[PDB]
Amino acid sequence: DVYAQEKQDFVQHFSQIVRVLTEDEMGHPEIGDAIARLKEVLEYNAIGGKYNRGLTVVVAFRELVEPRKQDADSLQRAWTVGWCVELLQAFFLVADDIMDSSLTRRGQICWYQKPGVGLDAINDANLLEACIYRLLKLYCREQPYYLNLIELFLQSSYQTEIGQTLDLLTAPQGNVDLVRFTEKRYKSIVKYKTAFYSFYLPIAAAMYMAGIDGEKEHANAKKILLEMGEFFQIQDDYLDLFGDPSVTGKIGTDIQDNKCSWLVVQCLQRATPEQYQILKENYGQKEAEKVARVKALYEELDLPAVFLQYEEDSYSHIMALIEQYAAPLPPAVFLGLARKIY
Amino acid sequence: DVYAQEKQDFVQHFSQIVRVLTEDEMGHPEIGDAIARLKEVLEYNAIGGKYNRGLTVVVAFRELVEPRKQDADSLQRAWTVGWCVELLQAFFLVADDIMDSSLTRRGQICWYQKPGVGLDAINDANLLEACIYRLLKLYCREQPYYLNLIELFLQSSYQTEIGQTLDLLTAPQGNVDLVRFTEKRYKSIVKYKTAFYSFYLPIAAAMYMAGIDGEKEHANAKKILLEMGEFFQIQDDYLDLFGDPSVTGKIGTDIQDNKCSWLVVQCLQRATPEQYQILKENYGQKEAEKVARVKALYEELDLPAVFLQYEEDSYSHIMALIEQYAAPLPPAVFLGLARKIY
Ligand SMILES: Cc1ccc(-c2cc3c(NCP(=O)(O)O)ncnc3s2)cc1
Ligand SMILES: Cc1ccc(-c2cc3c(NCP(=O)(O)O)ncnc3s2)cc1
Secondary structure (H helix, E strand, O other): OHHHHHHHHHHHHHHHHHHHHHHOOOOOHHHHHHHHHHHHHHHHHOOOOOOHHHHHHHHHHHHHOOHHHOOHHHHHHHHHHHHHHHHHHHHHHHHHHHHHOOOEEOOEEOHHHOOOOHHHHHHHHHHHHHHHHHHHHHHHOOOOOHHHHHHHHHHHHHHHHHHHHHHHHHOOOOOOOHHHOOHHHHHHHHHHHHHHHHHHHHHHHHHHHOOOOOHHHHHHHHHHHHHHHHHHHHHHHHHHHHOOHHHHOOOOOOOOOOOOOHHHHHHHHOOOHHHHHHHHHHOOOOOHHHHHHHHHHHHHOOHHHHHHHHHHHHHHHHHHHHHHHOOOOOOHHHHHHHHHHO | OHHHHHHHHHHHHHHHHHHHHHHOOOOOHHHHHHHHHHHHHHHHHOOOOOOHHHHHHHHHHHHHOOHHHOOHHHHHHHHHHHHHHHHHHHHHHHHHHHHHOOOEEOOEEOHHHOOOOHHHHHHHHHHHHHHHHHHHHHHHOOOOOHHHHHHHHHHHHHHHHHHHHHHHHHOOOOOOOHHHOOHHHHHHHHHHHHHHHHHHHHHHHHHHHOOOOOHHHHHHHHHHHHHHHHHHHHHHHHHHHHOOHHHHOOOOOOOOOOOOOHHHHHHHHOOOHHHHHHHHHHOOOOOHHHHHHHHHHHHHOOHHHHHHHHHHHHHHHHHHHHHHHOOOOOOHHHHHHHHHHO
């Protein structure tokens, strides 16, 4: 991977990200205990994932900038901005896991379930978000793209938070209501809640760092990348239930949780009224056999075939979008991502 | 009040703040349900207080700008930025009330305790914060002070969130530990958690709107205003227990809640070891008589006299600070605030 090549250097820069977010305030003995807590919060929640989003900033910056302008300090800013994208994500997850009452995240105890944390994790989460703008100011304050990146991350938060409201409205806990689970609503939630920050954000950020700041160039990249984000999430919903779980590690609780999955959406538009009932009675419940009987209704409806059909169509749609909207960015910016996700 | 004069026009602008935060997205039928939720969140949580912080932006802008540059649109931006300060506050309180497990706020049910809200209020809170930057962009994007205000509000969040961590570390729930309750720690919590956003923020914001953007001018105003914020909070802690409660409406649960109040701090530095014990045994507990016996130990120690003594010293300290650090701002900027708080 062009990712495994830059990965080491990405994770190693984290030590410096942290030093700087705790050292810059060495003039204030008074708040040392809060800054220690902050460190623990950064270490527990920004570390442990694959870093795909943050790393995309770095890879894209390398492909976008003329190599004579990749001086040591330019790269340091790319690593730093990649970590900003990872902290934005760590803010969202720490807060989501509290809202979902999740137990674990990456098979580790969620931060809010640790002894002594509880709902204080709400402030911790907000602190992760604040670190983003601290780092931008520390590293990028003099740069012509400074304001551009501030606005991009604030817009990234807002889109995500809007998509979270939409999700929450669409799939309450303690409420089966499949009338909400439409195709338009599904695409909407995906686009606002995950595709903007997961896919648009990191390429956009490298684009601004590269001086590529035109509205049209960004609109064009966004068209391709929101489309990829849509596919990524649909594949996430398919795997949840059909992914061989040793190939994931996770085990899908989508159905138990009344999630607006891609599966239940397709299911609903493909179902005589007797089918509705079996779903209306088994969706969003805890026991194995009532969750086995939904997996059975999906298998019975060749939704795995439907997915494979969707994955094929989607891949040629994305490639046509690259052909049509990538220029004047090197198509490889988008092709590297397409390769990771297909 | 110079406040009651501009108040009406402040509260009336809220209708427009909301229209604009829900109308600007009329191109996106898809997210209408999230935007309705947002409206409800704004209406329930940004309305109902006295608006002292937001109004300070407006009053200060009027005293700082030459009146030939107070065109209709300039004022609209001042009203809007005042509402930004109120939304920053509404974000903090919605989240604090969740962390504290509070029941009511302004004698109304906290937003997170409303049926159907619960911990979704965490996203709602974050949405209040995001509205700030949406409004700044909508109203102030072309202005030379734009970036200055963005940075000021992000710094205001960060300071507050840091002070919240400090508070949370200092006064856990389920932990009497008076060893943490020192004078230095109290001043620290107050300065970071409430004085920066309550007092520095709104004057600073008007200063930038006025073109007053020098680091020295801001450092000077900050010295005066963090000092006022310290006093305001100390008076808040005194009143909690001794304020005639018809003059407040509230009724102080500081002692029950193991709060790092100004009172328990003074108490501790003024106490033989037998006194420590009575406090160590009665602080942070629920029943009336164990809370009556702390109020008794305070009265017994002439802490009300101590306060009145502190209030006198404080008022001349502030006035000397105004004399010394106000220029070239009109001293009235600071004197109006001193008048509200003393
Ligand atoms: C911008 C970007 C780039 C790549 C990804 C990927 C996530 C992921 C993945 N997800 C595991 P995860 O649930 O994201 O830890 N599994 C296998 N391949 C990939 S590629 C996500 C976002
Ligand atoms: C910038 C600024 C200006 C004024 C205030 C005041 C709050 C307040 C007050 N507080 C009642 P509150 O608990 O703030 O609703 N009560 C009486 N006078 C005042 S003045 C707080 C902040």
